[PDB]
């Protein structure tokens, strides 16, 4: 389920990955796991598209990636081809504080679901974790992470 | 908060580790991490004490250990010296379905607290994890895991 009345142009800017859930532990287990990306910045495009830069631990460095997400019939759902994903769902956001999105493979959504809570500042906002919490309620997550500001300044 | 009116003689038997939480992500992350033990059988003693056997993955094996839990002035609290812990608090239990317990080192509860949901049967039991969740609210856990029945039957 996605997000009504979402101007993606208003999410733009630097962001922080506060919480992560995933339907398969193996997706998040170990910092070498896929779908363990760490969002950096949101930069949508005049034509409505959305470009995400983030970090991953691949080799023994914290590599940085850049996914481009083309807009669709649905404002809140985007197409990608990274991390073996092809859907990007924005669940909810007030633009100023937090952003809630998921990633999933349409081929098998259930076993590919990864969801993060994004934050504008690298400080805890429990207000968000709650709305992240209710959002994950119906969602079959078996692994859950969430990071501290000290953690928030660290690379990967 | 612990468990009042606790007949430790009634918790004895086989159990399954359904969900795993820990105050420190490093405690649970990766299949090698400490405090990623999987409780096997619970056998209290005539003297009131409680003897617990479980598995942990150390080398390329599913290792088996045996933690012994001394009773204390508190009926619900037992003392151990394993997994880098020194305390075992049993939070809640019906004896027949679920048991909720935690581990923590008094030296640093914050950085050692790990809490498990235990089940008599190798099946997911939504009834129990709900009571697990309410416990975890007041608990500062930064990592959450939970397994499927398949996983529950597997060795490690």
Tab-separated table of C-alpha atoms in Angstrom, chain B residues 11 13 15 37-45 49-55 64-70 78 80 82-83 88 101 103 118:
chain	number	residue	atom	x	y	z
B	11	UNK	CA	8.481	-24.575	32.636
B	13	UNK	CA	10.713	-29.398	28.844
B	15	UNK	CA	11.225	-25.193	23.839
B	37	UNK	CA	21.909	-19.284	21.185
B	38	UNK	CA	18.826	-21.415	20.520
B	39	UNK	CA	17.209	-22.804	23.675
B	40	UNK	CA	16.580	-26.548	23.451
B	41	UNK	CA	15.314	-27.987	26.738
B	42	UNK	CA	14.468	-26.476	30.127
B	43	UNK	CA	15.138	-28.593	33.215
B	44	UNK	CA	14.757	-27.009	36.653
B	45	UNK	CA	15.962	-28.778	39.794
B	49	UNK	CA	17.411	-24.054	40.347
B	50	UNK	CA	17.007	-24.166	36.567
B	51	UNK	CA	19.235	-25.962	34.066
B	52	UNK	CA	18.981	-24.929	30.421
B	53	UNK	CA	20.522	-26.605	27.378
B	54	UNK	CA	20.864	-24.867	24.011
B	55	UNK	CA	22.841	-24.565	20.780
B	64	UNK	CA	25.707	-27.241	21.900
B	65	UNK	CA	26.144	-25.730	25.365
B	66	UNK	CA	24.552	-26.092	28.803
B	67	UNK	CA	23.891	-22.994	30.910
B	68	UNK	CA	23.078	-23.495	34.592
B	69	UNK	CA	20.878	-20.904	36.291
B	70	UNK	CA	21.076	-20.380	40.053
B	78	UNK	CA	18.424	-16.710	38.145
B	80	UNK	CA	24.444	-17.574	35.303
B	82	UNK	CA	27.647	-17.870	30.311
B	83	UNK	CA	27.275	-16.003	27.017
B	88	UNK	CA	18.451	-14.434	33.610
B	101	UNK	CA	12.874	-14.507	29.181
B	103	UNK	CA	19.623	-12.204	29.491
B	118	UNK	CA	10.200	-19.527	23.676
